[PDB]
Amino acid sequence: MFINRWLFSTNHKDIGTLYLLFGAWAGMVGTALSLLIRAELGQPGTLLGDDQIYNVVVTAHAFVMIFFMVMPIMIGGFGNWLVPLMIGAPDMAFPRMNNMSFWLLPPSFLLLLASSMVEAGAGTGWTVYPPLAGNLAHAGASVDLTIFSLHLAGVSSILGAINFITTIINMKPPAMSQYQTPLFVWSVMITAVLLLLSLPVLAAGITMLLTDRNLNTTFFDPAGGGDPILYQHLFWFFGHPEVYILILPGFGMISHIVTYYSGKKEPFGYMGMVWAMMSIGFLGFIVWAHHMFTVGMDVDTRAYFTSATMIIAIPTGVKVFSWLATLHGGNIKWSPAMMWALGFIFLFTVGGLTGIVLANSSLDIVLHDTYYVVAHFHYVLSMGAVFAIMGGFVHWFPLFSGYTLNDTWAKIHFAIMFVGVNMTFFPQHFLGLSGMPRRYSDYPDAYTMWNTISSMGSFISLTAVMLMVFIIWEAFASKREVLTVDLTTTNLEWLNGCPPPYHTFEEPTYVNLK
Amino acid sequence: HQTHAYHMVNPSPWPLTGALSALLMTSGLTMWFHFNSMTLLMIGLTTNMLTMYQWWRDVIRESTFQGHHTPAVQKGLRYGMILFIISEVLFFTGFFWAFYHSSLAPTPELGGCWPPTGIHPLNPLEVPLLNTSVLLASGVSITWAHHSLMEGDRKHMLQALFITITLGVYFTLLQASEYYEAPFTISDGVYGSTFFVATGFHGLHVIIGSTFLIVCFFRQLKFHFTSNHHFGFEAAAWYWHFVDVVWLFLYVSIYWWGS
Amino acid sequence: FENRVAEKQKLFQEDNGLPVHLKGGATDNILYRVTMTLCLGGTLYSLYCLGWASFPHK
Amino acid sequence: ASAAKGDHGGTGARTWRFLTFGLALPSVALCTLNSWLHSGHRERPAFIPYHHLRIRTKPFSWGDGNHTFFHNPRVNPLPTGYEK
Amino acid sequence: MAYPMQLGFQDATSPIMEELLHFHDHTLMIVFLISSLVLYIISLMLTTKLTHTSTMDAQEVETIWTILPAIILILIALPSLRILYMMDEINNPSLTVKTMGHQWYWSYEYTDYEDLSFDSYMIPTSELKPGELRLLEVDNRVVLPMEMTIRMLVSSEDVLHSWAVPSLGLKTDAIPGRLNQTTLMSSRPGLYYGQCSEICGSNHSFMPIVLELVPLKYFEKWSASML
Amino acid sequence: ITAKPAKTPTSPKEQAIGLSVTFLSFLLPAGWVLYHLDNYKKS
Amino acid sequence: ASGGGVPTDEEQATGLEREVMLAARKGQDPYNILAPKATSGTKEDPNLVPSITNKRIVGCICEEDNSTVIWFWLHKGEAQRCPSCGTHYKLVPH
Amino acid sequence: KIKNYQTAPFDSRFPNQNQTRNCWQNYLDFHRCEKAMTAKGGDVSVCEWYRRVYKSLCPISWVSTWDDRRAEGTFPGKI
Amino acid sequence: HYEEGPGKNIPFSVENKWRLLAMMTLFFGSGFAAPFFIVRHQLLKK
Ligand SMILES: CCCCCCCCCCCCCCCCCC(=O)OCC(COC(=O)CCCCCCCCCCCCCCCCC)OC(=O)CCCCCCCCCCCCCCCCC
Ligand code: HEA
Ligand code: HEA
Ligand SMILES: CCCCCC/C=C\CCCCCCCCCC(=O)O[C@H](COC(=O)CCCCCCCCCCCCCCC)COP(=O)(O)OC[C@@H](O)CO
Ligand SMILES: CCCCCCCCCCO[C@@H]1O[C@H](CO)[C@@H](O[C@H]2O[C@H](CO)[C@@H](O)[C@H](O)[C@H]2O)[C@H](O)[C@H]1O
Ligand SMILES: CCCCCCCCCCO[C@@H]1O[C@H](CO)[C@@H](O[C@H]2O[C@H](CO)[C@@H](O)[C@H](O)[C@H]2O)[C@H](O)[C@H]1O
Ligand SMILES: C[C@H](CCC(=O)O)[C@H]1CC[C@H]2[C@@H]3[C@H](O)C[C@@H]4C[C@H](O)CC[C@]4(C)[C@H]3C[C@H](O)[C@]12C
Ligand SMILES: C[C@H](CCC(=O)O)[C@H]1CC[C@H]2[C@@H]3[C@H](O)C[C@@H]4C[C@H](O)CC[C@]4(C)[C@H]3C[C@H](O)[C@]12C
Ligand SMILES: C[C@H](CCC(=O)O)[C@H]1CC[C@H]2[C@@H]3[C@H](O)C[C@@H]4C[C@H](O)CC[C@]4(C)[C@H]3C[C@H](O)[C@]12C
Ligand SMILES: C[C@H](CCC(=O)O)[C@H]1CC[C@H]2[C@@H]3[C@H](O)C[C@@H]4C[C@H](O)CC[C@]4(C)[C@H]3C[C@H](O)[C@]12C
Ligand code: CUA
Ligand SMILES: [O-][O-]
Ligand SMILES: [Cu+2]
Ligand SMILES: [Mg+2]
Ligand code: NA
Ligand code: NA
Numbered sequence A: 001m002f003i004n005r006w007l008f009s010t011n012h013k014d015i016g017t018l019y020l021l022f023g024a025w026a027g028m029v030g031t032a033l034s035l036l037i038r039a040e041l042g043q044p045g046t047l048l049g050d051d052q053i054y055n056v057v058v059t060a061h062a063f064v065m066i067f068f069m070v071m072p073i074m075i076g077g078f079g080n081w082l083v084p085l086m087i088g089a090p091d092m093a094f095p096r097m098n099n100m101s102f103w104l105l106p107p108s109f110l111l112l113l114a115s116s117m118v119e120a121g122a123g124t125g126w127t128v129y130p131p132l133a134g135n136l137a138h139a140g141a142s143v144d145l146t147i148f149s150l151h152l153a154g155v156s157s158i159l160g161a162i163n164f165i166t167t168i169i170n171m172k173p174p175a176m177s178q179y180q181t182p183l184f185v186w187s188v189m190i191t192a193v194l195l196l197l198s199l200p201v202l203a204a205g206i207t208m209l210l211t212d213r214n215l216n217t218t219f220f221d222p223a224g225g226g227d228p229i230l231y232q233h234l235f236w237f238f239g240h241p242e243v244y245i246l247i248l249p250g251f252g253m254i255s256h257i258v259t260y261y262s263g264k265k266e267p268f269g270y271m272g273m274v275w276a277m278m279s280i281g282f283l284g285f286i287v288w289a290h291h292m293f294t295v296g297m298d299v300d301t302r303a304y305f306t307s308a309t310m311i312i313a314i315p316t317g318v319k320v321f322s323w324l325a326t327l328h329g330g331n332i333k334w335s336p337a338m339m340w341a342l343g344f345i346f347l348f349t350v351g352g353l354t355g356i357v358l359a360n361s362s363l364d365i366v367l368h369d370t371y372y373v374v375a376h377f378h379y380v381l382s383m384g385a386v387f388a389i390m391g392g393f394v395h396w397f398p399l400f401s402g403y404t405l406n407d408t409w410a411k412i413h414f415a416i417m418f419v420g421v422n423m424t425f426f427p428q429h430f431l432g433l434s435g436m437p438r439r440y441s442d443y444p445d446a447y448t449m450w451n452t453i454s455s456m457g458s459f460i461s462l463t464a465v466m467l468m469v470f471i472i473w474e475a476f477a478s479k480r481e482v483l484t485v486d487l488t489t490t491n492l493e494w495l496n497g498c499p500p501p502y503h504t505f506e507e508p509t510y511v512n513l514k
Numbered sequence B: 001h002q003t004h005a006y007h008m009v010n011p012s013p014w015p016l017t018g019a020l021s022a023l024l025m026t027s028g029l030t031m032w033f034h035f036n037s038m039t040l041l042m043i044g045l046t047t048n049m050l051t052m053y054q055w056w057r058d059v060i061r062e063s064t065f066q067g068h069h070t071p072a073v074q075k076g077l078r079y080g081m082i083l084f085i086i087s088e089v090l091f092f093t094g095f096f097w098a099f100y101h102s103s104l105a106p107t108p109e110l111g112g113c114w115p116p117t118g119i120h121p122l123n124p125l126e127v128p129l130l131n132t133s134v135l136l137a138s139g140v141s142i143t144w145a146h147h148s149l150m151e152g153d154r155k156h157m158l159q160a161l162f163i164t165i166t167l168g169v170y171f172t173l174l175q176a177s178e179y180y181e182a183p184f185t186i187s188d189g190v191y192g193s194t195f196f197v198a199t200g201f202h203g204l205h206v207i208i209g210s211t212f213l214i215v216c217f218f219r220q221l222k223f224h225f226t227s228n229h230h231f232g233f234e235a236a237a238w239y240w241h242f243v244d245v246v247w248l249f250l251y252v253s254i255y256w257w258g259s
Numbered sequence C: 001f002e003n004r005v006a007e008k009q010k011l012f013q014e015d016n017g018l019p020v021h022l023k024g025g026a027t028d029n030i031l032y033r034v035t036m037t038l039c040l041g042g043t044l045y046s047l048y049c050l051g052w053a054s055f056p057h058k
Numbered sequence D: 001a002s003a004a005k006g007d008h009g010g011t012g013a014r015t016w017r018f019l020t021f022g023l024a025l026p027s028v029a030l031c032t033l034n035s036w037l038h039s040g041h042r043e044r045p046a047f048i049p050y051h052h053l054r055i056r057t058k059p060f061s062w063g064d065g066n067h068t069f070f071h072n073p074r075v076n077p078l079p080t081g082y083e084k
Numbered sequence E: 001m002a003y004p005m006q007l008g009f010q011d012a013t014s015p016i017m018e019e020l021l022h023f024h025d026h027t028l029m030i031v032f033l034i035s036s037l038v039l040y041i042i043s044l045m046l047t048t049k050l051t052h053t054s055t056m057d058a059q060e061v062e063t064i065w066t067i068l069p070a071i072i073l074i075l076i077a078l079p080s081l082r083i084l085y086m087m088d089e090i091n092n093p094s095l096t097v098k099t100m101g102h103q104w105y106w107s108y109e110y111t112d113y114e115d116l117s118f119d120s121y122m123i124p125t126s127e128l129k130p131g132e133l134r135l136l137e138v139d140n141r142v143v144l145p146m147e148m149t150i151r152m153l154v155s156s157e158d159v160l161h162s163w164a165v166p167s168l169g170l171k172t173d174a175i176p177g178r179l180n181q182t183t184l185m186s187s188r189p190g191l192y193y194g195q196c197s198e199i200c201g202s203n204h205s206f207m208p209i210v211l212e213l214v215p216l217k218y219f220e221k222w223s224a225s226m227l
Numbered sequence F: 001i002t003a004k005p006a007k008t009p010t011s012p013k014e015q016a017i018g019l020s021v022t023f024l025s026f027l028l029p030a031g032w033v034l035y036h037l038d039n040y041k042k043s
Numbered sequence G: 001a002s003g004g005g006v007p008t009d010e011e012q013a014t015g016l017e018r019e020v021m022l023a024a025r026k027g028q029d030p031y032n033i034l035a036p037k038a039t040s041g042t043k044e045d046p047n048l049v050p051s052i053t054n055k056r057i058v059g060c061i062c063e064e065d066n067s068t069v070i071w072f073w074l075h076k077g078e079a080q081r082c083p084s085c086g087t088h089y090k091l092v093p094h
Numbered sequence H: 001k002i003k004n005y006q007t008a009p010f011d012s013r014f015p016n017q018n019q020t021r022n023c024w025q026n027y028l029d030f031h032r033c034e035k036a037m038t039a040k041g042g043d044v045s046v047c048e049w050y051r052r053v054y055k056s057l058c059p060i061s062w063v064s065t066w067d068d069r070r071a072e073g074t075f076p077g078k079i
Numbered sequence I: 001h002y003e004e005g006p007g008k009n010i011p012f013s014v015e016n017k018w019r020l021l022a023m024m025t026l027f028f029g030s031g032f033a034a035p036f037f038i039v040r041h042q043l044l045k046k
């Protein structure tokens, strides 16, 4: 029975649980890697070794945090648990294919771990640009293991995308149109469309890199008439949609959390929220070369990419102001999940605004490949995507498990993490403006003070991560079982109790048309 | 007991064996490229084929033999197949982007021209044109097969499907001979790289699509399809039209325009 | 060929509690055991190969 | 375009079989003829060791490492030229 | 170069860098204003026991918070693109200098007249002369004439690098097989530092750039002595 | 939310044990590696 | 040569597919493929909600085009009202 | 006709950041001019402008590689 | 069927909180420890 249930699953909730456990374990790996980065940089000089060991750590840090922590948790974890319940469906469309999306991920992670154990690892950056990642400057198996890791993660997400799109289009109650589905469901659908379109282009590009490394092709090798910059276009054609993939399910969870702890039955401006997520998804495909403003691109192309990138602020601002308008007039419950979501609104906005600074290609000449970029994306990832993950985890843990957290401990955890991430990353704006490059294991002496503060901040976040583990332990150890949950009339996923039975909606909901 | 029309699937080992086959194929390719050994790769390829066989076997058991494919389930599979084909289109789009990037801006190493100095392209009016007529013809014959099936005509369904498959095989054999006869190779710079990787992935999909048509052929021989319910045939025909259209883009772009 | 779908329908709808991947009979169990043995043994072998490749070999 | 043909009323198997045998397979037969007329080897050109061709950044994982997968001795020179 | 506890950009050495500073000041003011407004409104929404939980009509207010951000973006884009095209304008250089990236050092070529070229490596920390800067000095600096328009051409002979001098507002990727152009004009004599700005392997952190800007006559005599 | 009292209450002393064990499980192995870094590098 | 030999659904559909096909022919919807059409929803004319057990979840789209659906369990017994719009629903178990 | 050459002037054929083709074209032009002159008897001095421009713009290693391949018979451009 | 309810819809036991503490310790601790030991591994090669 144990093997049947947990290795042979065809159940959306158990598979969601598998993803949450996998993503939590990956989050520990990614945290350890982040602490090694900041230990190397926490005082001037060399701690670990030269830039190769340092940038194997940096590279693995990014792949682990993105592919094995955020996407499995948001899409595989919250998506599998919540989407079928939020539309009253009895499972996913392809419940057995769903299980393969999960089980491709431990092999993908093993391949990444293998990459770092063989030879001198893949010290390439998570962008894996040639020729540094090619077979002369990264001879041996490490980069190929990284490519294959991405291949498996990519198949996992593409099949998952097919599953979510099909489920959300085809398995709603017959009276429920797409404009009666909750915003988290919308956010997962749009994320899945971005995954479906973008990951095959990544797969093409990394396969070309694999054949340049092993079959003597020369897609990216000028000696054969290839071009390293072609790789960058294919990568970033995926890589910008990817950061919208990383935030969109977060936007969906934030809409639900803000609505719920404002005591509201609905988010402010529902159709504007749908419009904004679709607009962000669409604009996210036509801006990728803002990752390439220093490669030698014509001025008119730089002007286009500057302008197209900045436009995304308009739908994103509608979402931020709609969240604030959802709070407006609420009976505010100062739950730990609400604290995560309020921190999200503010800190995501800061990171979005530094992204708008970077969209200006003239300023980006000086800011590109410096810690100003690192500061931008850690405000939207460590204080955006992750704050939404923590908010959703604390909010829905009693649904998934049937047990409550200790809310005081969870508020303590939020407070520590909030101090930690801001101490880590706010000084990195100063380091970027003043010229500290990315992917450096050591820095000119002038940069010492902010690197020291930044590293101290990273240790505060470590303490928060350790406390999180204790808090989950304490909840399972004490076994306080949920009784009543308010606002079930507008939060269908709670209406089958905590935890819901293995099979829910065996009898579908009744929704009439009028 | 349920009162919706969707399919609760029995707990299944094939997702796990499929995922492990992916691990064995990729670690196997690594072992082959770097440690001079085909062992892991052959195991992975074997378990991959076993996984695909038993998984799609079970889908046939669930539908033809157990009746789980209600109209709602079939509609989901239709969306599933369309989305899968869309993802495959985007995969090929990356190789067409590589082709146009390199050929529209030929670098000095090439002679600054396309085709590169020293490259002698195949004549697009010889076997490439023949291959084009073959896949186009097979798109006509698979449409005849589809109409015969909907009209309840077992013999002409089988005849037309057999002709479609024969043409798929003909294309593959012609392409194999053209690969052997080609005076340029995959190592002949970006010309050979784009040519063989793009037409190579295309050829793999022709083989996949041909195999799928052959599966439909034997299920038809065993009377699995009704005149109204035959999604496996529809999916194989959509995939086959996708293979035909990718070929027409390759022909116009790489063989003709790029010659 | 004659149409024997009806007898397959009877076989795969028999009320015997078997999951669909084993419901054809003893050949299903054999093919399953072969598949899973190759997958698990191959996975162990891939781990051995990682162990080997993680160290220099002169 | 209406192409140049023209036969509906309620589409069907009979029309698509008509197209298969009356247009599609005859076109394949014509192209098969055209191709068999123009086959026959072409003179292999002088070998020139161009550096953008016969790329070898890593030995191939088969054979002696130096032969492409569908190596044809008649028309595919090695980096050092045509084989004996 | 950067100085300890620096918060903002290095002082401008070129007119284009001065334009960037003023444009950054303009944009940062807008960033601060919007960030603070959002923080303030959050606090406003959270500090009253008054409630209103029935359905709220969205149509009117969404005009405001679409139109106002569109106007703000235009107020950023206009000076942004002006600097972009001004950056791009024809200027007619007096001198062309190439730099080739390598693992892990830069080489320079001044071949308008004679065949002058040399390598430029970081000074190891153990060999710094007293008062020299760790990780920033090089053995052979890029001597250049001040107050003159210079064409820099940037490439690489191995992996990607990127040739950067923050106080001149310069960063141009070094790509093998490609020859990227940028222009450089220093308003002042002096020493202007930068660092390799594309990850390039084991010593990425340790292949810096040092420009030495002097009067033309000094540059000419230096050039002749480097042959 | 409302909830039942804990079925198996975790006293302050029990929480102190769970917290201390949790923190040591993260800190001790990494501390051992970092403490011995010189030993690894000088090898 | 227009011949036959392809089974029809009537001949060969089985299991749940066949149940759905046979019920649709009778104009019945035991597997909930169609949206039910609302009554006036008064206490006199409540929406009749079929169930194979003694409670079923109702979602109430109170007004046309509302994006918010109001969800609640409907139990066997006296008609209940949507908590937002008051329209009446009554369970009909079978 | 008369020098005072300082560096290669702006060339409207090559107005963008990537100057690879500017270097390549002036290299080709110089050697094409050279070949034409040396044959019909005349003076390579008429080719001098292209020589100065490609020398200004082209990385030494590119020139060196191209020269080696011309000597080898493997230069892929047309001269 | 399968077990339903709190503590039963998970692949790990929560019947004893101290056994659970050990299991969670091994689980999260092994993830956090792995990069330090991979770094050590790479340092002890070259
Ligand atoms: C926004 C994230 C939350 C805050 C996180 C930590 C909070 C720390 C304060 C931080 C509280 C916000 C104040 C920020 C400006 C402080 C530094 C400055 O004078 O910046 C100057 C510029 C460059 O300017 C110059 O070239 C002139 C230099 C003038 C020197 C004068 C001497 C100053 C004394 C030294 C100051 C030490 C800095 C402290 C170092 C701080 C270490 C942590 O640098 C920069 O652009 C940095 C670019 C940052 C872009 C992100 C903007 C986010 C704004 C959010 C604020 C909302 C409401 C505030 C209220 C926010 C309260 C939450
Ligand atoms: C969650 C992930 C995430 C998100 C959501 C974003 C969102 C944005 N990013 Fe970010 N970005 C990254 C993750 C993300 N980014 C990563 C990982 C990198 C680096 C990759 C690498 O090199 O490794 C990066 C790099 C990156 C660059 C390249 C910089 C360089 O390398 O030199 C740029 C440049 O334009 C950019 C811009 C933006 C913009 C304009 C947005 C916008 O979507 C933000 C829009 C939001 C707002 C503007 C705030 C809310 C709005 C209002 C309150 C309305 C009013 C506001 C105005 C009127 C301005 N990003
Ligand atoms: C989701 C993405 C993500 C996240 C969360 C983080 C988190 C952190 N990152 Fe990361 N980082 C990247 C993505 C991310 N990073 C990327 C893409 C790069 C560029 C790589 C490259 O240059 O190639 C990068 C680069 C980068 C650098 C630059 C290295 C360089 O240029 O040399 C630094 C340095 O300080 C850094 C530090 C940190 C720190 C201290 C954290 C800390 O905030 C981490 C703190 C801990 C957490 C945030 C908790 C994590 C765990 C969970 C959330 C699981 C929760 C469990 C349950 C819910 C059950 N990162
Ligand atoms: C470097 C080399 C790397 C190699 C990596 C290989 C990785 C994976 C190993 C793959 C093993 C595949 C085994 C067969 C999987 C068949 C899946 C399938 O057919 O899934 C179907 C759904 O997907 C659908 O239709 C439509 C979708 C069909 C997808 C078929 C499988 C595709 C796998 C590769 C996808 C790559 C996409 C690439 C685009 C770049 C059915 O879904 P189930 O939930 O099963 O059933 C539901 C029941 O109601 C059926 O009666
Ligand atoms: C899941 C992650 C997996 C990552 C995969 C990385 C690639 C793994 C392939 C490596 O396989 C090893 O290759 C060696 C070299 O071919 C073999 O030794 C062979 O060659 C040795 C060196 O000559 C000799 O000592 C031995 O006789 C002989 O067994 C060894 O047995 C084999 O296992
Ligand atoms: C970034 C994540 C890590 C953050 C910081 C970790 C905080 C460190 C926690 C303590 O770790 C222990 O520290 C001891 C020293 O205090 C080490 O003992 C070492 O030193 C002792 C004292 O000299 C000797 O008695 C021991 O034998 C010798 O192993 C011991 O191995 C190590 O487990
Ligand atoms: C970046 C990409 C080239 C990718 C490649 O080198 O492979 C090119 C191809 C087509 C280009 C676009 C088209 O030329 C149309 C537009 C032309 C404008 O002058 C700039 C924006 C503009 C929208 C271009 C931006 C960018 O240069 C594009 C998208
Ligand atoms: C055996 C079967 C008769 C129909 C039935 O079983 O009732 C017949 C009808 C259609 C026949 C097939 C089709 O006519 C197409 C093919 C024609 C080739 O000449 C022989 C194989 C070929 C594949 C035939 C084999 C076999 O004779 C088939 C399959
Ligand atoms: C069901 C189970 C799979 C367990 C798994 O999923 O972990 C069993 C059933 C038959 C077993 C296989 C073989 O029939 C027997 C092999 C020898 C031993 O008895 C066990 C390993 C052995 C190689 C088995 C692997 C695996 O444990 C199998 C496949
Ligand atoms: C028409 C459509 C859906 C309305 C509905 O059927 O409920 C609504 C939903 C979101 C609306 C958009 C968003 O509110 C954002 C913009 C707001 C501006 O006031 C008008 C244009 C604007 C772009 C709106 C146009 C239009 O009214 C949209 C697109
Ligand atoms: Cu050179 Cu980084
Ligand atoms: O990517 O921003
Ligand atoms: Cu981007
Ligand atoms: Mg860069
Ligand atoms: Na350091
Ligand atoms: Na059909």
Ligand SMILES: [Zn+2]
Pocket: G060, G061, G062, G063, G070, G082, G083, G084, G085, G086, G087
């Ligand atoms: Zn109502």
